[PDB]
Amino acid sequence: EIVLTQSPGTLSLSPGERATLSCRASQSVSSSYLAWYQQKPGQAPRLLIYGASSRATGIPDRFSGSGSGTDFTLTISRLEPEDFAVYYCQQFEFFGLGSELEVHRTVAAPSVFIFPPSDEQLKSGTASVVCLLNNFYPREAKVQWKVDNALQSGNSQESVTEQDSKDSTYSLSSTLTLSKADYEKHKVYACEVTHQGLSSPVTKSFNRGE
Amino acid sequence: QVQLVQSGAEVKKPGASVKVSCKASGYTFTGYYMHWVRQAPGQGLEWMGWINPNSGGTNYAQKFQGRVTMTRDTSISTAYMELSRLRSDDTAVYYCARRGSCDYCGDFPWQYWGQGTVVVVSSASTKGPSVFPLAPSSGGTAALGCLVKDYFPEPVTVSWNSGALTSGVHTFPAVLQSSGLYSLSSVVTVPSSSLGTQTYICNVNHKPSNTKVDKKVEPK
Numbered sequence: 001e002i003v004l005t006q007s008p009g010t011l012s013l014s015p016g017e018r019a020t021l022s023c024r025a026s027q028s029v030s031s032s033y034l035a036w037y038q039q040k041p042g043q044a045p046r047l048l049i050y051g052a053s054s055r056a057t058g059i060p061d062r063f064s065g066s067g068s069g070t071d072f073t074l075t076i077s078r079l080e081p082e083d084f085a086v087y088y089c090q091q092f093e094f095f096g097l098g099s100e101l102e103v104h105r106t107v108a109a110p111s112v113f114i115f116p117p118s119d120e121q122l123k124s125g126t127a128s129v130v131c132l133l134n135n136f137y138p139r140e141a142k143v144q145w146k147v148d149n150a151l152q153s154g155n156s157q158e159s160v161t162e163q164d165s166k167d168s169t170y171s172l173s174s175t176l177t178l179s180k181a182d183y184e185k186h187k188v189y190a191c192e193v194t195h196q197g198l199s200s201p202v203t204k205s206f207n208r209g210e
Numbered sequence: 211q212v213q214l215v216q217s218g219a220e221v222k223k224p225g226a227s228v229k230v231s232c233k234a235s236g237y238t239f240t241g242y243y244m245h246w247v248r249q250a251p252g253q254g255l256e257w258m259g260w261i262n263p264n265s266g267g268t269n270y271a272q273k274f275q276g277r278v279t280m281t282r283d284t285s286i287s288t289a290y291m292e293l294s295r296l297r298s299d300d301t302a303v304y305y306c307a308r309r310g311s312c313d314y315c316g317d318f319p320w321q322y323w324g325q326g327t328v329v330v331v332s333s334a335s336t337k338g339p340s341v342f343p344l345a346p347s348s349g350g351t352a353a354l355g356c357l358v359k360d361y362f363p364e365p366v367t368v369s370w371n372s373g374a375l376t377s378g379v380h381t382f383p384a385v386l387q388s389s390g391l392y393s394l395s396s397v398v399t400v401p402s403s404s405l406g407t408q409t410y411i412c413n414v415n416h417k418p419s420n421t422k423v424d425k426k427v428e429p430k
Contacts, residue, residue, distance in 0.1 A: 035319035044305055044323035045255070050315045057311060057321070092318050093257045093271065113353045113397075115344035119430065121359075130344060130395055132353060134380070159382035159394065171380045173395050177387075 002027055006089045006096040012104045012138070019076040021099045023067070023089035031068045037088040041162055045088065049074065084163075102139075103168040109197035110136035110172070112204045117183065127183035129176040131191035131204070135169040138196070143174045146190040146205075152176065183208070211236040214306055214324035221330045221363050227294040230327045232306035234287040240264040243317055244289045246280065247305045249326075256302075260317070263289060301331045330363055334390035337362045338419035341412060343427045344397065346405055355397030356412035356425055360389075368396040369413040405429065 003026040013019060023036075036049040047056040049065040052072055065074045076083060084103055089096035110133035117127040131143055139160065145152035155178065161171040174191065190205035213235035222228050232244065246258040259270035261280035268280045274293070281290045293300060303326045310321035339361035346354040358366055368381050378399040384392040400410070412425040 032314070033316040033318065035316075044326055046323075047310065047319060047321045050310060050312065050319040050321075054312075054315070088255060090255075090318065092316070095255045095257070098254050111353070113347070115347075115355075118342040118345075118357075121340075121342045124340075128342075128357065128359065130357060132355075132397055134353065134397075134399060157385040157387070157393075159385055161380055161382055171382070173382050173397070175385070175393070175395070 002029060002091060002094045004089050004091060004094055004096040006087075006099050008099060009097075010100050010102055012102040013079055014104045015079045015081060017079055019074075019079060019083075019101060021074040021087050021089075023072045023074070023096055025070050025072075025091065028069050029091050031072070033091060034067075034072055035090040036065055036074050037090065038085050039088065040082075040085040048087075081165075103163055105137045105168045107197045108135060108137040108167075108169055110134060110141065110193060110195055110202075112191075112193050112202050114189075114191060114204045114206060116189070116206050116208070122180060122183075125180045127178050127180055129178075129189050129191075131174045131176075131193075133170075133172040133193060135164075135167065135171065136195060136197060137169050139163075139170045140196075141172060142194045143172065144192050144194075145174070145176050146188075146192065146203075147178075147186050148188050149190075212308065212322045214308065214322060216304075216306060216324045216327045219328040219330075221332065222296055223333055224297050224331055226296050227292055228296060228329055229290055229292040230304050230306075230329070232289045232291075232324055234289075239287040239289075240284060242308055244280075244282075245307045245309075245318075245320060246291050247307055247320075248302045249305065250299075250302045258291070261289060261291075296331045298331055301329060303328055332362070332390055334362050336418050337391060338421040339366055339414055339416050339423070341414050341423050341425045343412070343425060344395070345427075345429045346402075347429075350402065351399055352402040352405060353397055353399045354410065354427055354429075355395055356414070356427055357393075357395045358414055359393045360387075360391045361393070361416055361419070362391050363418055364392055366394070367413075367415045368394075370398055371409075371411055372413060375410075 006023040031052045034052040037045040039045040062077050084101045113132040115130045158174045192203040194201045215233045217230045240263045243260045245260045248256045261268045263282045305326050306324040307320035308322040309317045339358045342357045344355045346352040381396040384394040410427045414423045
């Protein structure tokens with residue numbers, strides 16, 4: 001049961017810098033049968049390195065790898081715009097969970113918006129409230145729903161866009177699912193945002209029937 | 211010029227049996243082993259097994275032992291894999307791969323890959339989307355969008371003014387609801403002053419239901 005553990009999980013860097021990804025095996029393994037892969041969103045993985053050292057046919061000279069026994073590394077110099085993806089580590093059947101290369105950017109604050117349920121949707125018997133966060137960095141953010149003033153949990157789903165190509169920001173949208181009965185039993189609906197770019201948590205709310 | 215082409219996306223109910231194909235192009239089909247790899251939607255890679263096309267011999271992973279059978283067709287260049295007794299956690303992308311150009315780097319460092327076959331395992335039926343608007347509110351700019359709720363299966367395309375607006379648009383990935391139907395929202399940031407004059411229209415298209423919808427977005 002050879003277990004490959006690769007770290008760090010997330011690495012935020014700027015173009016032109018150095019990148020190091022370590023893949024540590026649980027027990028000693030043979031260096032002649034290791035591989036490094038790269039996978040971008042929507043595509044199949046690319047083979048980068050085979051045997052821990054040798055580079056696959058067609059990959060540039062800025063990719064290199066080494067190691068033996070437990071620990072193996074992958075080093076990439078001169079980061080390009082297309083080198084931000086996920087990198088996997090493989091040894092026969094066993095794989096690694098992965099490591100992500102993120103674009104680094106100055107801290108940005110999310111513009112918070114909210115939208116009350118539509119009059120059309122309230123005919124079906126279910127109400128939905130949506131909270132919107134626009135162009136923020138880093139990706140880590142927490143959105144908490146507050147019907148009236150009670151913290152809601154278990155009735156929300158979130159979607160996060162991938163990092164932008166130009167400004168390298170993120171966008172998040174959380175939804176709230178309540179029935180027509182539960183929606184008409186309350187007045188105030190709020191979704192507060194906690195982000196390191198906000199000096200204090202920002203709360204946007206509205207009042208039902210107003 | 212080695213090329214591997216797979217089957218299209220398929221949707222099946224738990225317990226059924228899905229078969230996906232993988233056609234070779236630029237090499238002797240029987241000369242190299244053919245592997246199969248599964249990748250969950252949010253997770254990583256998982257190895258299923260290989261089939262030697264020259265003899266038909268197989269070797270499956272311990273997890274799929276007794277649930278999967280890999281066949282081949284030498285007349286064509288297609289290698290098949292069939293996963294029986296499906297359940298919900300089998301929903302993933304299924305790739306077929308092939309070892310590299312070297313000799314003794316192993317049969318597992320795969321240099322050539324297929325395009326992948328999406329397989330969704332669910333008990334739901336085909337349902338069309340329901341589009342609801344998101345009305346703008348009161349500083350320097352305002353945001354608005356439309357919400358696509360309750361549709362199956364994925365995907366749907368969302369555009370604005372019939373593809374006349376690109377900057378500011380943000381189409382989020384879908385979320386699987388407990389009812390089995392997906393849902394997503396798509397928004398756009400616009401100047402707060404052009405709110406009363408410029409008209410904004412949502413465009414939703416769901417092919418599995420053959421449903422084309424244009425929706426009006428206006429402040430209530």
